[PDB]
Amino acid sequence: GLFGAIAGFIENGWEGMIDGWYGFRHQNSEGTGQAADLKSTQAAIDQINGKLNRVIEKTNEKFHQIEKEFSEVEGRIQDLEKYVEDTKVDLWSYNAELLVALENQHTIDLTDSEMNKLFEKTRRQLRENAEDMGNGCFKIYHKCDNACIESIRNGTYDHDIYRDEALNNRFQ
Amino acid sequence: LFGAIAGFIENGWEGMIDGWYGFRHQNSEGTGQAADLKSTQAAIDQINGKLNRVIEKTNEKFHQIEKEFSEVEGRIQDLEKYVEDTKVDLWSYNAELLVALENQHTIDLTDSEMNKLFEKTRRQLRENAEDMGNGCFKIYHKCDNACIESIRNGTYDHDIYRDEALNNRF
Amino acid sequence: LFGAIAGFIENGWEGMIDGWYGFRHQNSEGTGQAADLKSTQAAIDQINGKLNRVIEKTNEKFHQIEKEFSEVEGRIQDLEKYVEDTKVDLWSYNAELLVALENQHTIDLTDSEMNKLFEKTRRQLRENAEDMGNGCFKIYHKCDNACIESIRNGTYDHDIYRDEALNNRFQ
Amino acid sequence: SSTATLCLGHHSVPNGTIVKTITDDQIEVTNATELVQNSSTGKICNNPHKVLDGRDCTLIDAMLGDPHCDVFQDEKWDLFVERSSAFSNCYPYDVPDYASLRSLIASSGTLDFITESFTWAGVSQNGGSSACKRGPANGFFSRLNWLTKSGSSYPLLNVTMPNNYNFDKLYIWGVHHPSTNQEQTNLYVQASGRVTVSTRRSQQTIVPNIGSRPWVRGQSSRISIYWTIVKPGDVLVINSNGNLIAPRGFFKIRTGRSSIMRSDAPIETCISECITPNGSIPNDKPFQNVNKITYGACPKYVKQNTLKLATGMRNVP
Amino acid sequence: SSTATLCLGHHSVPNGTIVKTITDDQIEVTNATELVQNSSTGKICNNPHKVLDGRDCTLIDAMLGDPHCDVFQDEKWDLFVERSSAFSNCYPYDVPDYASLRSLIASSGTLDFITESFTWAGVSQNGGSSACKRGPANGFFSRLNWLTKSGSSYPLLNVTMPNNYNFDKLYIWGVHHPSTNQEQTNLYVQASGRVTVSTRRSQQTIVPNIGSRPWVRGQSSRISIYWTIVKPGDVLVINSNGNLIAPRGFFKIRTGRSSIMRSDAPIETCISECITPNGSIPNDKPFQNVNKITYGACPKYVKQNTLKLATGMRNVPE
Amino acid sequence: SSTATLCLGHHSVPNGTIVKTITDDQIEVTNATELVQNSSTGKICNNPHKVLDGRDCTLIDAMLGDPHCDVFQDEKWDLFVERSSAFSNCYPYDVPDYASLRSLIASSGTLDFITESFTWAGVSQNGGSSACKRGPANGFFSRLNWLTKSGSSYPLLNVTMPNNYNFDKLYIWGVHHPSTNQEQTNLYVQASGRVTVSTRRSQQTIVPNIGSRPWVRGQSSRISIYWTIVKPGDVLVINSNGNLIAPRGFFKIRTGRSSIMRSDAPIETCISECITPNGSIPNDKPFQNVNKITYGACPKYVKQNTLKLATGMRNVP
Ligand SMILES: *[C@@H]1O[C@H](CO)[C@@H](O[C@@H]2O[C@H](CO)[C@@H](O[C@@H]3O[C@H](CO[C@H]4O[C@H](CO)[C@@H](O)[C@H](O)[C@@H]4O)[C@@H](O)[C@H](O[C@H]4O[C@H](CO)[C@@H](O)[C@H](O)[C@@H]4O)[C@@H]3O)[C@H](O)[C@H]2NC(C)=O)[C@H](O)[C@H]1NC(C)=O
Ligand SMILES: *[C@@H]1O[C@H](CO)[C@@H](O[C@@H]2O[C@H](CO)[C@@H](O[C@@H]3O[C@H](CO)[C@@H](O)[C@H](O)[C@@H]3O)[C@H](O)[C@H]2NC(C)=O)[C@H](O)[C@H]1NC(C)=O
Ligand SMILES: *[C@@H]1O[C@H](CO)[C@@H](O[C@@H]2O[C@H](CO)[C@@H](O[C@@H]3O[C@H](CO)[C@@H](O)[C@H](O)[C@@H]3O)[C@H](O)[C@H]2NC(C)=O)[C@H](O)[C@H]1NC(C)=O
Ligand SMILES: *[C@@H]1O[C@H](CO)[C@@H](O[C@@H]2O[C@H](CO)[C@@H](O)[C@H](O)[C@H]2NC(C)=O)[C@H](O)[C@H]1NC(C)=O
Numbered sequence A: 001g002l003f004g005a006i007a008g009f010i011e012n013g014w015e016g017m018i019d020g021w022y023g024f025r026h027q028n029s030e031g032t033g034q035a036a037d038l039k040s041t042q043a044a045i046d047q048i049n050g051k052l053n054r055v056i057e058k059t060n061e062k063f064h065q066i067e068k069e070f071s072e073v074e075g076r077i078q079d080l081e082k083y084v085e086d087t088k089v090d091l092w093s094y095n096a097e098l099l100v101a102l103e104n105q106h107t108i109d110l111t112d113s114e115m116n117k118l119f120e121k122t123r124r125q126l127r128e129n130a131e132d133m134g135n136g137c138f139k140i141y142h143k144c145d146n147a148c149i150e151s152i153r154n155g156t157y158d159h160d161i162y163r164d165e166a167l168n169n170r171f172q
Numbered sequence B: 001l002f003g004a005i006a007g008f009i010e011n012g013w014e015g016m017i018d019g020w021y022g023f024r025h026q027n028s029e030g031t032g033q034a035a036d037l038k039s040t041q042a043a044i045d046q047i048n049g050k051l052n053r054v055i056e057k058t059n060e061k062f063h064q065i066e067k068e069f070s071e072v073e074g075r076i077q078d079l080e081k082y083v084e085d086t087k088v089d090l091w092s093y094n095a096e097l098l099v100a101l102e103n104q105h106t107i108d109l110t111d112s113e114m115n116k117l118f119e120k121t122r123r124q125l126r127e128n129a130e131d132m133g134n135g136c137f138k139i140y141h142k143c144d145n146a147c148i149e150s151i152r153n154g155t156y157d158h159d160i161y162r163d164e165a166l167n168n169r170f
Numbered sequence C: 001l002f003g004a005i006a007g008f009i010e011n012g013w014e015g016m017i018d019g020w021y022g023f024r025h026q027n028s029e030g031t032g033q034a035a036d037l038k039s040t041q042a043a044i045d046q047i048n049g050k051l052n053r054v055i056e057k058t059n060e061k062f063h064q065i066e067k068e069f070s071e072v073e074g075r076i077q078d079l080e081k082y083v084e085d086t087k088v089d090l091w092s093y094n095a096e097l098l099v100a101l102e103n104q105h106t107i108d109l110t111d112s113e114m115n116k117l118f119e120k121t122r123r124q125l126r127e128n129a130e131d132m133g134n135g136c137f138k139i140y141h142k143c144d145n146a147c148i149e150s151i152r153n154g155t156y157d158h159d160i161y162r163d164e165a166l167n168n169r170f171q
Numbered sequence D, F: 001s002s003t004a005t006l007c008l009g010h011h012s013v014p015n016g017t018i019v020k021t022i023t024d025d026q027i028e029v030t031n032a033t034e035l036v037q038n039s040s041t042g043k044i045c046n047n048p049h050k051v052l053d054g055r056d057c058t059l060i061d062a063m064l065g066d067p068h069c070d071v072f073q074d075e076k077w078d079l080f081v082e083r084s085s086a087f088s089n090c091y092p093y094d095v096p097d098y099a100s101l102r103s104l105i106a107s108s109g110t111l112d113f114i115t116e117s118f119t120w121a122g123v124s125q126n127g128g129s130s131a132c133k134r135g136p137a138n139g140f141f142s143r144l145n146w147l148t149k150s151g152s153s154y155p156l157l158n159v160t161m162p163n164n165y166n167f168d169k170l171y172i173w174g175v176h177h178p179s180t181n182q183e184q185t186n187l188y189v190q191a192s193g194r195v196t197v198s199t200r201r202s203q204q205t206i207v208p209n210i211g212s213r214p215w216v217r218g219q220s221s222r223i224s225i226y227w228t229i230v231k232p233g234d235v236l237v238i239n240s241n242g243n244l245i246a247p248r249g250f251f252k253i254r255t256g257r258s259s260i261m262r263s264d265a266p267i268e269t270c271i272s273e274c275i276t277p278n279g280s281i282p283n284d285k286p287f288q289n290v291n292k293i294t295y296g297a298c299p300k301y302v303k304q305n306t307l308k309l310a311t312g313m314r315n316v317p
Numbered sequence E: 001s002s003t004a005t006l007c008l009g010h011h012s013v014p015n016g017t018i019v020k021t022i023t024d025d026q027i028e029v030t031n032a033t034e035l036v037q038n039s040s041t042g043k044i045c046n047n048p049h050k051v052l053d054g055r056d057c058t059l060i061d062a063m064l065g066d067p068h069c070d071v072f073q074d075e076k077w078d079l080f081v082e083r084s085s086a087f088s089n090c091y092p093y094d095v096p097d098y099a100s101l102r103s104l105i106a107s108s109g110t111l112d113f114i115t116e117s118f119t120w121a122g123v124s125q126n127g128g129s130s131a132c133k134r135g136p137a138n139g140f141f142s143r144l145n146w147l148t149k150s151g152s153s154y155p156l157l158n159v160t161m162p163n164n165y166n167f168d169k170l171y172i173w174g175v176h177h178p179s180t181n182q183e184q185t186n187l188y189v190q191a192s193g194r195v196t197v198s199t200r201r202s203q204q205t206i207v208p209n210i211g212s213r214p215w216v217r218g219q220s221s222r223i224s225i226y227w228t229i230v231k232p233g234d235v236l237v238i239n240s241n242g243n244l245i246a247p248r249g250f251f252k253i254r255t256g257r258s259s260i261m262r263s264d265a266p267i268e269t270c271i272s273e274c275i276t277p278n279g280s281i282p283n284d285k286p287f288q289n290v291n292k293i294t295y296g297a298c299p300k301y302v303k304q305n306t307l308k309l310a311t312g313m314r315n316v317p318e
């Protein structure tokens, strides 16, 4: 939510992209199509992982400890033992709460970052051959067939081939 | 972390008593100032909830150990003091780290909502205006009060003034 | 998190010994390199302070419980060992989480200062230049050494080259 | 004038507040709030908890039955407040492991006492001392029975009391330590006393010690206080050759959220869920700097006296 | 149509999960994983730890030598399980500082006992009681020698036993508390007993207590249990005027990662590192809400029952 | 021509550090610093803390008055150092609740002793033994008086000493355990001794116990060490039938930041605010991995041996 892409200028998520986490959708003369971007998906997954492993990694072996349940009242020592256990449990409960909240907030922010980074990169690729609507979609101003879209998705798009075509169609 | 406040905006308007973020325009009819309720409420809803998850009541304790002593005893008293001292230090660090972490995130998000409003206005005025390096927009067509209000509402149409603005631009 | 370093900048200039960030220009007179003090000092002022808030002295303890024992005793020794073990494990978690959180923010803030310099330059050269996708700018007019220094200073005027650059960009 | 200017900005305030971030130590924000409570009203609110004020009495003295602590019989409390002006005005005594007895009585939260019909054959009962006055003449601790010789013989005592209830019983008994060998024989005939109190799972035996001690309220002797707990279905047996301070019954011991606190703050009519020795404090804030000793729903104690949490953007005036 | 359209977006899911962030409390994400383990199988796995089930016996009774606990002699364990149904069936006794003795025995992880040749001159040994039956005949705690008068005299006992080994010796002894003076004189000629167990660096002396006590298995008398540890190169001296419950040897005491746990769960054939009184639990998660008493490689105990951790973007379906 | 190119970038270094972040575990940055101190200088610095080295003496033995510990009379310290080679060379003894007495002496920070004029009528004083030699003659613990019979009688002792000062007093006394009945009657006429030391709010009575104990410097007997504390305005009473190891005075007990530490590291002339048994460690870092026993302004103990904190951007080649 901190970069304004998901729940932002994208509006909605595509329920139906079973191939990846981020992808492209195009409307063309030949017909509409859909693809998935592995780089942004694998970058986000590799960040969600590692994050998981740092939390999950086992860090606790304890064998002999203090008694934590009692059947007879005794006084000072029992008061001390219970107070120690209560303090330990409360401190670890706070640590778990703060960890989960902090990790979840960063998880949302990095998914916006990857989406906004993909959008910005495509803007640089489509230098002056397209302009941006406020819906997360681009309007290409030249005849862009299926091989043309595949080149944009790959990153091998050449703007000089279609520059004068778009500039004429953009400005009178 | 986003520029904006203490950044490409330079200064903060002391006098916007209507909201947290807003617009100011210089027009052929005159100058004006308004406030944006979407971004202001979005921020307030984020500072809130942050406040509630911190303020929420916990720590109901009834019987505990003794923490003040009149007679020197030795092993047990030293143990009871060390337990209490360790607890107090760990919570003090928890309080300091929490405040510092939340305060940084509060600054970062307030930058985000201003940057988000700035880019929303930029995408509305597609080619009818261009970015002056101060957080202000120079609109290249005649834009009356109804025109400015349409921009603030989000119902601005660039196709109406596209060819007029393009002529004055280039 | 902002895409500048390990992103649309590709590489790092191993050889900038003057500052953390800077400009490299290719010109008719020749190539050159400079450094930006504002962003470098802003980042340095942020890594510092973070360092000082972590490095400040905090605890001064004199008399405590025993932590090593020569004879097995039972209940009291078990409590004393458990208390010390609980304390050490909690602080070790605090040290680990603190380092992970600060390092993540240090990486992020260095992207921000770089992305903020790039966005400031793009807003400064409004229509006289346009992006290239590698952290560089294609300036569409003649820009000598004094011209470049005016961009780095922030005293660049875009109207002096507006018509020349617009014609070179469009029809 | 075929153009227009549109600017975006944020509010500023004439007076900001300084907070602490991670990258900076002194940064100004428009609004901020305080997370640490560093003040107390000084008035201990009497609601919602049941606060019992022991004016001149400690908990043990009230439990024992000091004549000037008699107004506390069969009392109950959520929090017992022990004043620093408290004193003892009965027979000099000491309690081995005094803190543990005080703690478990405080956690029980009640002084409900049930008198049981003990039978002490061959000995005289209801002893009194000039050190423990009940009005104009000698008296003793209530809830306790001083036994001495009847005539010229002190017989061996063997009494029993089963626990036919479904709750635990707490018994308070004592042993008398004379100051001279003559005082031992004058009250108990036998030259060496002995007290044994035991159940099916525990035992206690104390041998009295004869010797001079500091003179407190006219007495060179002392009394040691002991306690025993009898589970349901268990039985209590007391065997004594002499020097026995017999119990008069048992204390009903409960499990609850009661405790004891030392304070000198006055008690007023108000509502507060958190109690400290300095008084009552509100608990709207997560942390507090007043005292590390608290009772109730209280903010956690921290060393810092101030912690500001930002509730607005940075103030750029 | 001279123009095309290219749209960038992110996936949604028909069903999301609710997590908790810093700014919001209820926010939906595409995927999430649970971090708290809140269920127990109920079956205590017998691997990889060596779990010893003491059915009707406590650890102290097994150490002392209760006849119905004789199957536990010279045992060893990693976790000793004490069932709620255990009972004592020997001479009634109490252990001053019972918890410390139980804790150090449990941490030792062994009941290996070595018999030593003590010489008690002038007294009769191997006494027993009807309260502690070994089959049809009267018996006593094993590893424990009840000494009474021989004939009409009870001589002074002054015995020594050095530690010529390279490991600590754990000794267990006791003092017998008669109920009447006529019984104290009958068992031991001296009217007031005394037991002194000492080393070069520590001493313990007990005076027996006389008094009537509630009948436990027909006995009004009691026995108190004490322990002494002899370092290598040290020496043990026992001096007594009577009322001595002599030891029969020393327990080997080791340093290890053993412990004791009170539970009623059954033990099954399975594999699990973490043992709780509620049973064994897996350790693939960093936190657990089952029990605060644990043994082995366990998740840390927390108060919360659930903690969802986000593993995807926010879910925004319309 | 007719154009130009302007590029924006960041520095790189030919060599980075591997640090750890939230998302990754191995990421390279230009600059980083260590936060965990994992080394000690091996030399305990004598500044600014006042370090006292008890070469062959433990704190209790120095307090008691062992003849080879006589050089430690009226000493003061901030940190007492106990060496592993310390031994005892006087009458064999044991201290019930040894650790607590060691704790309160160490925290008191001083061994300031004041001799008081006790009157022991009818008994001979200044006992000694071959086990505790002071030169060529038999001696005993200083600050301790061994009282035995005078002629053929051992009277009852009843002596008092009030606390007319405004600071607490610490009294160290003892009880003698003979090895045989014949030795008990030989030193004290009575066949069974008794020591009672009490104040207006406390009492302690010990009945000695006869029996052989291991040979320690020619002695099969033992001495048990106890302590009592008298508040200002309170009084001390000692009543003994025999076997009493009387005190010669009181220790002045203070409140401060003194402690004790067990180490075998040497002491040098240097300045260090933090002391560990391994030696003195610098405190320029927030965490340390040398030892969990510390004294002074010290980094917190952690299990990790290294924790790198990034101080530069990511290193990209
Ligand atoms: C109750 O039982 C205990 C033991 O069972 C008896 O205590 C023993 O008492 C004897 C003395 O009567 C002790 O023996 C003495 O040992 C000294 C050396 O001790 C050891 O340590 C050194 C190293 O420090 C070794 O070198 C040495 O070999 C020993 O192993 C000797 O120095 C003593 O001197 C004897 O010999 C010389 C002649 O050379 C004579 O002049 C002396 O008078 C003396 O006879 C002596 O050998 C023995 O150590 C004690 N044992 C314990 C365990 O304490 C009690 O006496 C007994 N009580 C009763 C009432 O019977
Ligand atoms: C053993 O010694 C103690 C003191 O060393 C003796 O106790 C003392 O006894 C006298 C009375 O005999 C007490 O005096 C009293 O003082 C009050 C005023 O405080 C006065 O009003 C009384 O009339 C009486 O005179 C004295 O306080 C007391 N001292 C202490 C410390 O207890 C004790 O009598 C001696 N025992 C034997 C058997 O000699
Ligand atoms: C002191 O009091 C205790 C308890 O008040 C007495 O203990 C009791 O002793 C009697 C034996 O006289 C026990 O009764 C026995 O019961 C069986 C039947 O189960 C019967 O066959 C025997 O002949 C005998 O009567 C009784 O259980 C026991 N109770 C307890 C609680 O210990 C003790 O005898 C008294 N001693 C003196 C000297 O008065
Ligand atoms: C609350 O009361 C406590 C008393 O227990 C105060 O703490 C003491 O304050 C005095 C005066 O500064 C110091 O000399 C003592 O050393 C303090 N004692 C302890 C144990 O800290 C405390 O200052 C009071 N707080 C408020 C807000 O009234």
Ligand SMILES: *[C@@H]1O[C@H](CO)[C@@H](O[C@@H]2O[C@H](CO)[C@@H](O)[C@H](O)[C@H]2NC(C)=O)[C@H](O)[C@H]1NC(C)=O
Residues within 6 Å of the ligand: F013, F014, F015, F016, F017, F030, F031, F032
């Ligand atoms: C990377 O190597 C550089 C050297 O190229 C290190 O920096 C300096 O190294 C010289 C020796 O070549 C020393 O004299 C300086 O004191 C060093 N300065 C600093 C600030 O370190 C640098 O430390 C190395 N960094 C890493 C991460 O290995």
Ligand SMILES: *[C@@H]1O[C@H](CO)[C@@H](O[C@@H]2O[C@H](CO)[C@@H](O)[C@H](O)[C@H]2NC(C)=O)[C@H](O)[C@H]1NC(C)=O
Residues within 6 Å of the ligand: C051, F031, F032, F033, F311, F312
């Ligand atoms: C690497 O970082 C350290 C800081 O962690 C730099 O050294 C610091 O320099 C400042 C003065 O500017 C001092 O106040 C600090 O005490 C120094 N700290 C340390 C650890 O040396 C160091 O110059 C940096 N080096 C490079 C090559 O970036």
Ligand SMILES: *[C@@H]1O[C@H](CO)[C@@H](O)[C@H](O)[C@H]1NC(C)=O
Residues within 6 Å of the ligand: B051, D031, D032, D033, D311
């Ligand atoms: C600051 O915020 C609090 C709520 O967190 C509010 O009650 C208060 O009125 C605000 N003050 C100002 C000056 O905005």
Ligand SMILES: *[C@@H]1O[C@H](CO)[C@@H](O)[C@H](O)[C@H]1NC(C)=O
Residues within 6 Å of the ligand: E031, E032, E033, E311
């Ligand atoms: C979501 O997480 C679950 C584990 O809880 C896993 O089985 C599933 O494959 C994950 N799906 C995606 C799309 O990550």
Ligand SMILES: *[C@@H]1O[C@H](CO)[C@@H](O)[C@H](O)[C@H]1NC(C)=O
Residues within 6 Å of the ligand: E038, E039, E040, E277, E278, E289, E290, E291
């Ligand atoms: C585990 O057992 C304890 C009893 O000691 C009980 O309080 C708790 O609710 C149980 N938890 C589970 C998950 O079975």
Ligand SMILES: *[C@@H]1O[C@H](CO)[C@@H](O)[C@H](O)[C@H]1NC(C)=O
Residues within 6 Å of the ligand: F038, F039, F040, F277, F278, F289, F290, F291
């Ligand atoms: C410090 O000394 C302890 C012994 O008490 C030893 O275990 C540890 O390894 C030592 N550490 C260092 C850094 O010397």
